[PDB]
Design a protein around this ligand. Structure first.
Ligand SMILES: [Mn+2]
Ligand SMILES: [Mn+2]
Lengths: 295, 929, 295, 93, 295
DNA sequence: ATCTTCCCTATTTAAATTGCT
DNA sequence: AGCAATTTAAATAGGGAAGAT
């Protein structure tokens, strides 16, 4: 149905499902499933999303883009977007890359800001862990998890190279995997090819994390070819680097809870998008990328 | 590339193929699509149009030639898209198909009459030895022969009589004898040990009367009386009417059986036997469940009683009848029209336009492609196959890696895996490292392809991956041993799959000279069997000997005589297509093949001789070949080098010879910077493969990319001491070679490993031939028998290569192409030609090539063994730890340039050398120390 | 999964008008108001433009973006005079190759390397002219075109800024517009809002080269927010910078021929597919932009 | 003059027009004919395709423009030949 | 009953091979020996041919003849050098225009008039070369072809006997056949019983030109039984003059091109249709016999 | 809403047979 | 031998309903 997502401060990423978007009486509306029309205010939204069962028309597209309301096509849920155009400074007056994009590029270029931003993305990944506290998952304030957190903090702060950061990131990620395996009474080893519940649930949750990180990178105009940790030849490595922030804080406890209770995949999708809507995870990633790129 | 796809399909199989074909092409209406797409788009459209299910009725046209035809859609013979096709088109005097139907039906209702003895009943129930004293096929043959001796076997009531033990069941009646041989050899063929019988027997019945019970059926023989006391519970309704209708069918058609020739009878009975094992294995594979008890034929996996013998005989009959129908009335699935073939060859491929001199409407074709290496022989073979229309062929090649090379050529030029099927039946662990994404190589085993309609008559829907790739391949790029079993096997049903493969597909055999003599005999047997069904044989060998080319033509001519008299057509002759890089010649040859072939050979020789001599060979005078190798290495480095860096190939004969030359050269004190490699075949999986890839990338001299795989900065002698593994299937280019003489085709092939890629002529001498083989010091009576055609029956009078070879000679294919039978005792070339005409002769013998009468027996598969080697046990290296008596050793570390280590893999050791330790080493594999 | 066709090897391109694009039994098909459902080869489509009166569902965008089809709309800022925002959704769900972004932005940030790259893309105009010749129009080897190409190269060699570049563009394009017009015996003033065929066919070819240029950009991962030409009238970004390589070589001769030989919009559209696949212009632009970024 | 005729008729009338359209053009299969004919050939084909009865559903294309459209066949607005035709298209005020 | 289609604008063209020709449900068709029934467009067919294994019926022949389709049978050649005998069913039930036969008779009976017509028809092949120029093969206006046709015209101008015409005919055929052989770099000898593709493509074109010539002669009512060129070697009728007017202009370069490119026979059938249709070779022959008859 | 699957729904094609000329 | 009438039946198209996202 109609879904509101706060992204930066005031603009809202509207998600529209099972509706036909067109122009009625000179302004953009949409007929919904229940046969009731709903209009959209142009002032409070910049991102508008078209989920499953949704069609838009040409003059609705044109009038939405002329009002600064830039449209994207997404899979139902609002965090699995497959089609959009690039954010500019203004949609009609000029065509310039966003300040965030340019800042990211400059930071990526000079080697020192790239290393500092790699350290910072891991700092905010540890922050994400504490910030987004779950109920079924392990305690972030537990002594073993806090020891892993301080080990990662020491290792990131004392490192001067990227391959050290990759080893430390892998140690932290799989150490949280080991901690959640110690919670849920299983021998868990992370492999994509396994058909067990924990590994495949973590895989499709990671794909959801890639989708929401892709939406967060798109919404500030950040391109998908400037990874911090991963190599220059890794296709879409920045999506993986941004999704790393919430892979071990949100996706991992939800996936282990989902494999523990053993429910099906669509209701895991609704749990993931419910956690994304409730705690504003996309807005957290948007502010994370602003604080990374602004420096 | 502009294509147009039309659909003939009923169902919603005109609907769920429409989604995929409308994903790639625009819709022009009326279930017709048309548009532009890439060749990889054609491959993707093929892969997701075939995999979508059964019943897809799709014809594609590229310009106006048909690209592909999914299913058995008749589509186009002249025009495309017919109107309604109903029934009753031709209805001739089919005769021989009615003959095969009658023989297969009569034999298949009698093939398992011999399981009714009490011994087979307690064998199935399991209180005696599971191996019978006399096999049940022979007991059923005894039943049928006793019934024929008693009553008139063609028109009478059946009733199984009291049968005794008979040593022979073959009489004089030609048709009864056919039924008896089909009954007895529905599991294995009879084997004749008798030397006089093997010497003299030629005809159909006159050989079949020598097939006794002692040829494999009579295992041990102590419970014969229980093996011949038989119940007669088969007399039921449907069995008796099926037997009556098939016997009367045979009765009505056997009048054309006596008008056949010997060649016909043999080929027709081979087809009948193949269809009979097809039906028998098809009914034995599936579980039917129901049974009427008191008698049983087969057992399930649990050993319970199933498939009672009346319905077992009826099921084997109908399955064999249906096998025969689908193998005798099949329009087989052919390959795509490859668009990168049909254009002109440019430059050095410009001779490949010789296909524009061949008729495109000939039913038969015997290509002898005498073109030299590096001219694109296999591409020219594919061009010749595609000149007659769509391609359906079996590229049978020696070695796994040569099949890989032809597959990679087929992949990168135009052929996808929807038409090609690379088959190597060993599952080797040679993987490509470095970069999986940036490979663009390593042709693999997937075969999206198209499953043929012949899979339903094979046992348990053919098989899994391998036999689906075998049978259903339009183009089958395979190792040759998946095709030579078509001529027949000892035990089992391994004949049927290559038989039915070669029935509807052409045969392309490349470099047949590298095979053995018995291997070439069974390959020409395969050529005869392929020509028996009108398919075309392409032979591609530059160094062909007239003898070989002749006996392959005579095998094709006997096969085309079988095919011509089988369809009741008058035999006009064989369309022989002589081909080389200088021209082509297509003649309708029914007789005088020898003068035309030798005239083409002489024309090719005169087209080779006015070209500049590329291989000047000097036979050394130095007796001792160790120091002859030393002096020749020094001389050919001081004469033939690229700025101080030279590449030498010491071709020797055997493995301990190779390690002897290596250990001498490593301990050889000289000012030359010798860097020694060992390149024989006894090596562990890892080590061997590593040598191959390195050598292929350092001896590539079409460019200067090798300067970075070796140290060419310092003047260095890069020497590779190798056995005949270098002269077969290796695209290597050495600066010079020192050859230990074993055979003249070895001389020509190792000349082909020198200046293979360059075009610069040598000035003085680029080949130094050794004075003697090293077996002269071990056996002066015979020394050239190892990797040569010298033997105990063909002995050279002198072993001196001044006596048996020219001292200075330009080595090319001319000496092998000419053919000389005189003075074979004191020249190597005439010794070679002698053996080739004295083993591959136009006789039937028993191990020969025209084999007639013996195809009925197991003799051509026992005494003519394909890949006849020594015992060969395999010592296996498991993670650094050897299995048997191996004992790893340390090499001399004097001049080794490259040494790759190995941990897994296996080495093939002859049983003779198993007695002692093979002493595996990292540098050189096996030796005697 | 297979190779799924290289996007340079896709040959079908469409700009649909007055239709409802949807999925019927897994088929990308546009339905008109007369009840006619025409399918689209979505695995072979380069782009689908959407004209006025058009509409597309979610699932059609879902299986066009999965097959790598760029979908734009010809209204909004599609009046082509300002050329501000032609609403152009790209498939960024596929994680693109990154190295062309890296070499492109290394030369972008460096303004001297951007100036040199602009000169290379300005020389690509005359390269396109020489490579893609037409046998129904202006001969490239006559004295006027050779003189103006020589003047263009000697002006762009001694160029100093992007303001100097903007001017050279004025000359080339305007005078090639004019030179064709005098040879086609037509008083012609380029106007995106003009009704004559010489302008409506030119705007249709503008949208077609827009689609080819944007597909060539997205293929390499290159966006649009990194243009090489900066000016007052050059609003629109990198897609027009790539597209105006092939106005005067391809789009303008086809449009002029079409108007002169009285073609209909449908056949001009098809003449555009025939020239874009017979000379393989998409692979031309893709390989040439690899030459542009390279190091 | 090179033309292409596509037919989507129902009943035995589809077969009766196939005799006349197969008297003048070659059959490319799937109820589609395509070939070279003359100007007056197209006319004789029109005269004996229309007179054969009611319900003839014939579209002809000369190069790529539609030559003729027998009946009220919607045929081409932009592309030619639909698929899942059906009702309730627009239904306005 | 309308204008019944004039013969010079009839376009379809076949030689049917290994199929029994019949009538289903109204139309003439051919049924091969696999069940395939392909319809013959009898109202637009110029000629059909019947190869080995063909069998036509009575009412099929009637529907071809009453519509006016000349039908021959390809086999019958039994000599070593000559295309011996081709059996050809004339549609005489259509009563023919008469005065063109009277003009042909008044030129045939007068010996000096037959010689004069023999003269102009020998230079008719020379002008055929000049008019019908292919895009491939040789160029007609080179020095060798112009020198040989100039020697041919000079010799046929001073000719006074039909045996001199036969000799000059032989030198002309040897000159052209061998020059084409030189161009296509092959050795050529014209044998009708040869397996080489340059030869049986020439015999297929012999059958094609035979059918074209009887349709041209029957369209004006001219019989084959009035050969204006006669001799011991040249004994086929008028078809062996109006058929080999167009060997060295149409068929022989097309046969050599088809035997050089080397696909099947069907591309040669379709190429003969394409060149006999595009240049209107049938109407060209009819109009040439028209300007022959009234002069 | 969009799209899919399935059940009517009967409308719509292809085959089959067989006097008749 | 082609065809016509005329049956017979297999299949194609479409609309409505319900279940998914
Ligand atoms: Mn058995
Ligand atoms: Mn059995």
């Amino acid at each position: 149905m109609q879904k509101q997502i706060l992204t930066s401060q005031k603009r809202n990423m509207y998600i529209l499902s099972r509706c036909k978007v067109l122009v009625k009486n000179g302004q953009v509306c949409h007929l919904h499933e229940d046969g009731n029309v709903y209009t959209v205010p142009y002032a409070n939204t910049v991102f508008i999303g078209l989920a499953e069962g949704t069609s838009i028309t040409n003059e609705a597209m044109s009038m939405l883009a002329a009002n600064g309301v830039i449209v994207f096509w997404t899979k139902g849920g609002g965090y699995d977007m497959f089609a959009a155009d690039i954010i500019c400074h203004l949609p009609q007056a000029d065509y310039r890359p966003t300040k965030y994009m340019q800042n990211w590029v400059r930071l990526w270029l000079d080697e020192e800001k790239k290393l500092s931003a790699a350290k910072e993305i891991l700092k905010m990944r540890v922050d994400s862990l504490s910030t987004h506290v779950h109920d079924f998952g392990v305690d972030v304030e537990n002594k073993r998890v806090s020891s892993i957190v301080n080990k990662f903090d020491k290792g990131v702060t004392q490192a001067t190279s990227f391959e050290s950061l990759l080893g430390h990131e892998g140690t932290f990620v799989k150490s949280l995997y080991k901690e959640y395996a110690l919670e849920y009474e299983i021998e868990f080893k992370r492999d994509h090819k396994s058909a067990d519940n924990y590994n495949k649930f973590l895989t499709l949750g990671n794909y959801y994390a890639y989708g929401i990180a892709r939406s967060s990178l798109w919404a500030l105009g950040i391109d998908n070819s400037f990874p911090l940790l991963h190599g220059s030849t890794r296709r879409g490595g920045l999506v993986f680097d941004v999704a790393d922030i919430i892979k071990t804080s949100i996706i991992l406890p939800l996936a282990f809870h989902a494999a523990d209770q053993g429910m099906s995949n669509t209701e895991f999708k609704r749990s993931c998008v419910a956690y994304f809507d409730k705690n504003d995870i996309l807005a957290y990633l948007i502010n994370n990328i602003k604080r990374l790129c602004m420096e | 590339m502009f294509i147009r796809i039309k659909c003939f399909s009923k169902q919603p199989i005109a609907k769920k193929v429409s989604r995929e074909v409308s994903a790639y092409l625009e819709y022009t209406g009326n279930n017709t699509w048309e548009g532009h797409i890439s060749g990889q788009g054609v491959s993707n459209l093929q892969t997701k149009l075939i995999n979508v299910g059964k019943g897809v009725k799709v014809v594609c046209n590229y310009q106006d030639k048909v690209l592909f035809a999914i299913g058995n859609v008749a589509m186009s013979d002249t025009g495309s898209v017919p109107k309604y096709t109903t029934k009753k088109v031709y209805k001739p005097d089919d005769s021989i198909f009615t003959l095969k139907q009658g023989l297969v039906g009569v034999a298949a209702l009698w093939h398992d009459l011999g399981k009714a003895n009490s011994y087979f009943q307690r064998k199935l129930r399991g209180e005696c030895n599971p191996s019978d004293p006399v096999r049940h096929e022979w007991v059923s043959g005894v039943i049928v022969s006793t019934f024929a001796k008693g009553n008139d076997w063609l028109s009478d009531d059946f009733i199984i009589p009291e049968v005794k033990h008979s040593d022979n069941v073959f009489g004089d009646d030609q048709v009864l004898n056919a039924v008896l041989w089909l009954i007895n050899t529905h599991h294995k063929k009879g084997l004749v040990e008798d030397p006089i019988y093997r010497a003299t027997k030629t005809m159909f019945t006159e050989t079949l009367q020598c097939v006794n019970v002692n040829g494999g059926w009579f295992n041990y023989g102590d419970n014969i009386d229980e093996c011949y006391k038989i119940d007669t519970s088969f007399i039921t309704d449907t069995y008796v009417k099926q037997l009556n209708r098939y016997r009367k069918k045979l009765l009505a058609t056997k009048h054309i059986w006596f008008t056949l020739g010997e060649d016909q009878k043999i080929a027709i009975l081979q087809e009948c036997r193949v269809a009979l094992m097809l039906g028998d294995s098809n009914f034995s594979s599936d579980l039917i469940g129901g049974d009427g008890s008191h008698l049983y034929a087969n057992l399930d996996e649990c050993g319970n009683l199933k498939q009672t013998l009346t319905q077992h005989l009826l099921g084997v009959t109908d399955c064999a009848l249906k096998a025969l129908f689908t193998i005798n009335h099949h329009k087989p699935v052919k390959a795509n029209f490859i668009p990168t073939i049909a254009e002109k060859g440019e430059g050095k491929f410009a001779w490949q336009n010789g296909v524009n001199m061949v008729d495109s409407s000939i039913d038969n074709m015997f290509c002898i492609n005498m073109a030299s290496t590096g001219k694109g022989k296999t591409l020219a073979n594919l061009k010749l196959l595609q000149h007659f229309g769509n391609v359906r062929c079996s590229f049978g090649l020696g070695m796994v890696s040569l099949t890989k090379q032809t597959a990679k050529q087929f992949l990168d030029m135009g052929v996808d895996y929807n038409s090609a099927a690379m088959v190597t039946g060993f599952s080797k662990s040679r993987f490509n490292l470095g970069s999986e994404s940036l490979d663009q190589d390593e042709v693999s085993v997937e075969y999206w392809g198209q499953t043929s309609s012949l899979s339903k008559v094979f046992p348990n829907n053919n098989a899994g991956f391998k036999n689906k790739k075998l049978l259903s391949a339009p183009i089958l790029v395979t190792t040759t041993d998946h095709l030579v079993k078509a001529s027949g096997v000892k035990k089992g049903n391994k004949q049927m799959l290559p038989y039915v493969r070669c029935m509807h597909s052409d045969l392309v055999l490349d470099e047949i000279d590298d095979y053995g003599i018995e291997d070439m005999v069974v390959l020409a047997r395969l050529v005869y069997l392929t020509a028996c069904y009108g398919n075309k044989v392409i032979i591609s060998s530059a160094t062909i000997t007239p003898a070989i080319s002749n006996i392959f033509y005579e095998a094709y001519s006997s096969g085309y005589k079988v095919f011509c008299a089988n369809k009741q057509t008058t035999y006009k002759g064989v369309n022989v297509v002589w081909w080389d890089e200088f021209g082509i010649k297509v003649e309708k040859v029914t007789d005088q093949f020898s003068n035309l072939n030798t005239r083409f050979v002489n024309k090719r020789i005169t087209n080779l001789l006015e070209s500049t001599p590329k291989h000047k060979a000097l036979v050394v005078d130095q007796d001792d070949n160790m120091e002859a190798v030393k002096q020749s290495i020094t001389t050919l480095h001081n004469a033939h080098n690229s700025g101080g860096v030279s590449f030498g190939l010491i071709r020797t004969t055997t493995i301990k010879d190779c390690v002897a030359v290596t250990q001498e050269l490593q301990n050889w004190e000289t000012d030359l910077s010798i860097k020694i490699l060992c390149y024989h075949s006894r090596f562990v999986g890892d080590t061997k493969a590593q040598m191959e890839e390195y050598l292929s990338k350092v001896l590539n001299r079409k460019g200067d990319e090798y300067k970075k795989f070796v140290d060419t900065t310092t003047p260095t002698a890069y020497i590779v001491v190798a056995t005949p593994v270098v002269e077969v299937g290796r695209d290597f280019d050495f600066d010079w070679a020192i050859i230990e003489p074993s055979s003249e085709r070895s001389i020509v092939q190792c000349a082909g490993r020198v200046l293979r890629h360059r075009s610069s002529t040598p000035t003085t001498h680029n080949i130094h031939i050794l004075k003697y083989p090293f077996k002269f010091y071990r056996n002066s009576n015979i020394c050239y028998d190892v990797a040569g055609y010298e033997s105990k029956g063909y002995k050279l009078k002198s072993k001196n290569m001044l006596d048996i070879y020219k001292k200075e000679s330009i080595v090319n294919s001319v000496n092998r192409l000419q053919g000389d039978a005189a003075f074979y005792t004191k020249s190597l070339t005439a010794l070679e030609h002698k053996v080739l005409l004295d083993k591959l002769t136009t006789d039937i013998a028993d191990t020969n090539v025209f084999v007639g009468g013996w195809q009925l027996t197991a003799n051509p598969h026992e005494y003519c063994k394909w890949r006849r080697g020594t015992k060969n046990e395999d010592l296996v290296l498991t993670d650094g730890k050897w299995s048997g008596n191996v004992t790893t050793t340390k090499p001399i570390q004097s001049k080794i340039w490259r040494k790759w280590q190995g941990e897994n893999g296996s080495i093939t050791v002859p049983e003779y050398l198993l007695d002692k330790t093979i002493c595996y080493n990292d540098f050189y594999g096996g030796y005697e120390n």
